[PDB]
Structures are given as C-alpha cells and as structure tokens.
Design a binder for this molecule. Sequence first.
Ligand SMILES: C[S@+](CC[C@H](N)C(=O)[O-])C[C@H]1O[C@@H](n2cnc3c(N)ncnc32)[C@H](O)[C@@H]1O
Lengths: 257, 122, 32, 223
Amino acid sequence: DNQLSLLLKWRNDKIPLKSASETDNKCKVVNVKNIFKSDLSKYGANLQALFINALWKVKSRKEKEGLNINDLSNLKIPLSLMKNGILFIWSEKEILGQIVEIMEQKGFTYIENFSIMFLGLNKCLQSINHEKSIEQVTQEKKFVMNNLDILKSTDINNLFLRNNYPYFKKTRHTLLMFRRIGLELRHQRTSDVVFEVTDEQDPSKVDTMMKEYVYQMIETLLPKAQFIPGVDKHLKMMELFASTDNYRPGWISVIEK
Amino acid sequence: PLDFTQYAKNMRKDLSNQDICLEDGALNHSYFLTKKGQYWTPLNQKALQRGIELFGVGNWKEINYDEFSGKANIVELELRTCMILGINDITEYYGKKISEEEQEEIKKSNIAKGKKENKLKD
Amino acid sequence: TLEDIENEKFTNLEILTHLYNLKAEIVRRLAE
Amino acid sequence: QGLLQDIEKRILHYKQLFFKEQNEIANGKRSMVPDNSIPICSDVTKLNFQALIDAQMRHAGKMFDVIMMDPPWQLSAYDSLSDEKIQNMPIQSLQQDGFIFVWAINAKYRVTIKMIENWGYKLVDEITWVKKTVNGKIAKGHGFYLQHAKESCLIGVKGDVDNGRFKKNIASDVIFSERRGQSQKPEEIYQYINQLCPNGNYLEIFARRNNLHDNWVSIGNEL
Ligand SMILES: C[S@+](CC[C@H](N)C(=O)[O-])C[C@H]1O[C@@H](n2cnc3c(N)ncnc32)[C@H](O)[C@@H]1O
C-alpha cells in the first residue's frame, strides 16, 4: 500500500530535537551585520564543513523575505579559511544554475544533491478522518503519525504536495553540495530522498526534527570534524545564518544581528 | 498540421526506410513484429524464388555464396521455402527446378491431413 | 542446456537461437 | 540417440508456432507499435539534419515543440559519444520556440547544464523520478557521498514558449513509479509532456523501439 510506516519512520525513531548549549568552549556564537560583506577568515580556520542555511528570495516564495542570489558572488572564502571541505547550500528551482556557476568560479565542484519529498498534512488528516502555530502543527503531525493505519489504503500519489510553480508543480526541496580539493568521508549512509509531512504555507522553511535530520546527515558524512572536548582547541564546523536560540554543540553559529 | 495520420504517412515516406514504410505511406507492421535486423523483405522473397528457379531446392550453400539476399539467415531460407510449397516436408522435393509452383495449390487442398496454418502436415 | 534455449522471450524467428546450429550438431553427432 | 529425437520434436513444435505466427502476420496481424508514429533509423552524426528539417517544414510547417534527449554519456554506455560531439549537434536548428528535456546523470550534471546553456536554453526546471519497487518502497542505489534513489531530467526553455500551446503549472516535478527494464524512462513522462503540450510535434533523440508513441518523431540506431 502506501508503506508510509516505512517512509515516515525516521520521525518516530531515536531522533529527538537536541537541546542547545550555553556559551562555553563547546560552541561559539558570532553576531555579524552581514556574512556576505564580512571577512570570515578570523572566526574560524580550517573549516571542514560550511553549511549555508540560506533562505532565498524568489518569485516562487510569494510575499516573503530572504537572501539574494546576486549577493552570494561577493562572499570571500579565503584558502586559509577553507582548504578541504564540503559546502552545503539550499537551492530553489530558479537559481540552481546560478549557484553552480558561482560556486565553480570559486574552487568548488558540484558533487551531490539531496531532496525532500513533501506530503501534505491536510490531505493526510482528511484521509484519516474518513495561520496555524508551530506547536499546533507539531501536535497535528503527531496526530497524523499516530493514526498511521487508517490512511494506509489511500493512494500515495493522492497525498503528495502540489505547490504552484510556472512550469511543474513543486513537490521537493533540494540541498546542493560542493567540494574543494586542496576529508575522511563516511560515504553511503543517507539517501538522496527523504519523505516529510509538512505544512503547505511555506515548506522551504524547514522546521525542527527535520533540520535535525540534516545536521545528523552532515555530521555522519564528516565523522572527523566533531569537536571532542579537550582534544581539539578549535571548532571545525561552521553554520551560517544560525538560529539565535539553538546553539548546536561543536559548531560555529553565525547569526545576522 | 492537424492530421497526424496523413502527416505520419508523408513523414514516413520521406524520412523512413523502405522496410519501415509501405508504398502508400503505412507502417509495415511486420517489421515491428520482429527483432531488428531479422525482417524478411519482399526482395528477399523474390531472391529466394529466383534462386529456386535457378538452382532448385537442393542445398542452400550456393544461395548463400552468390549472396542474393545480402548474407541472410540460411535457416530462414529453408523455413520460408516450405511456405511457398505448402508442405513442411520438402525432403522428397529435393533439387527440383520450379518457375511456376503448380504444387502449392494441389498440396494445400488435401482434406485427409490438417490444413492448419495454410499448410499441409507431415 | 536444453531448456534455457527458449526461456527468454524472443521474436518468432530467433526462438531457434541455437537450433540453427543444433541442426548441424545433430548431423555431426550422428556422423560419429 | 534420445536427445536427437527430443530436439527434432521440439524443432517441429517451434516450427509449427513459427509458421502460425507468419501466417497471422501475413493475414494482417497488427503490432505493439502505434500508428501515427514516425520512426527514423540512422546515426545522429551521419544524419542529414537538413533533410529532416526540410521534411518537417514541408509537412508540418513548423519545427518541434518538445525535444527529449537521453544522451549516451561516456560513463561506462556501450554506444557512447564524446561531450563535444553531442555539443556539435545542430540542436539550435531543430527548435526555436519550445522545451528541451535532457536526462542527466550525476557525473554529467555540470556538463549538462553547460550544454543547455550553450545551445541557447535557460535552465528553468527539473523533474525528479523517484524509483519505486513492486512492494511500493523506495529503490536503493549506489553513489559516492550518498545513496542514489532518483534520476534528474533537466528542463531548459528557449524562445516564445507561452503561445497558446504549452500549459503551465500542470503536474508534479516528482515521478514515483516502478523501475521497468534497464535504462527505460517512466511512461508518465509522456503523460506529463501531453499535459504540457497537448497534441503537438515532438522529437526524441537516441530512441529505442519501446519509446515509439503517437505523433512522436524518433531517431535512433536500433529504432
Ligand atoms: C543511452 S540511450 C537509452 C535508450 C532510451 N533512451 C531508453 O529510454 O530506453 C541508448 C540508445 O541510444 C542510441 N544511440 C547510440 N548512439 C547513437 C547515435 N550516434 N545516433 C543515434 N542514436 C544513438 C542507441 O540506439 C541506444 O538504443
């Protein structure tokens, strides 16, 4: 049938949302007026990973705010900052070619891709029966995940999300990966495709419990950039456009403020 | 244009092989009912009949030497000769020169045997 | 290897994918 | 010996089946290939593309609306072509106002974007085909950083493409369908193209006989 008991199993497994760590030696928080206009060579050196949690301002996202693709070109990544490592970036459908060309003009070669397949929660709720806040959406998602054996007879193509786009309806959100060669990678442990039940208002803004999935993917892809206490005197992972509340241990959080 | 039957006929006449299109522009469905490179053309049938009238049933080594069909499958040669003669047992019809068959008509009208598949049975 | 000759689906002409040469294999094996 | 007798009996049986099949074909037995399809057998390098263009002008009066390519990349196939030879194709002449559908592998994602740019197209979309199993689960795969479970169809566009014969905001950019024979694209791509361009002129390059459809001009070595 749907097999949604297996396509949504990660949302009931041993993946909880991780509690933030206060300002100590395990995490470092930097407040900058603009990363795209500032020199990052001093905040961290020899970065083994660089995740750019970029929300893009495109025509697809209507009446929203976000970064601009033309502003990524003048982002200096010095060699001392970044010798060997992978750069992670969220991609829309309008700017994939611009992203890949801009990253090629800096020294990074496209290596991979990662997409999220979106199932609507309204469709799942309606199949189960026969402005929302984040806690309300969380409890609705918990309700959907509980009654996961009533909508098992439904056709999965009838539950997919179909958002408006000029050419084909939007059903996925993709993360591009680029690599610079001057890493002790762990290779095949996460699939390119993950299934998520999401609210339809703005699926680009990935929420917790799925951002945790991305963090776990990145941190199992790079098992030697972890900050072991005492052993390492500097952090090795940097995440730009961080959340001001959750400071992940072992990372450098850069928040625009 | 708003006529895909006639448009397909004309395009197949001008840009497709003679083994893929008919004279009027229709698909040669026999070509697509067989694997590529194994289609028996009417030219092959004419060459087979010409070789039969030239040399007879006999052995098929000579017909594969002078290459009337372009180095075709010899098994198809001693299979499609049975269709014209009407008997799946041509052992007694060995080495006979025939121009007009005169045998298919008489050997396809035997009611004692089974006239199945437009052919008499051994 | 007698049954494997026809397990795969072929075209009508190809179904004798080795009976083509088995036609002479039988003759040679009857010769000696 | 007994094996000779069994072989002779099997020969007689398959001979009878053979004879019945060609009798049926001579009667007028139709084929799985649809009518109204225009198959062309040639090599694309040796092809006289001017003749094809002139025929398309003579009959249809205008060039193709959707072009689909599944290029033979130098990744392993057994009939590959160089990237410059594929770039040397006169794709700029076969189309002026319409879409192009190029199936790109991960190793050839960047060069596919580059060729689509060089041919005069703008990369605007991309359809992901997620492979399903018979049970309905995700089919796994192999990669270097991650496991591959999808294939990419990069979609460029050039010229006036909204002129009353292309449809916007039609179908999902995800195909969740079972894996058919090797290297065979899902059948729903043709339905999506029908939703995109109803009853138009389509050209597909590097075609096989299983890709033959109504209204589709197809070019290939085996087709
Ligand atoms: C990599 S494509 C995949 C086949 C097809 N796209 C499908 O979905 O089944 C392989 C086909 O390309 C065709 N091909 C290879 N070289 C060609 C050439 N130089 N010109 C035209 N077709 C070619 C061959 O006929 C082969 O069947």
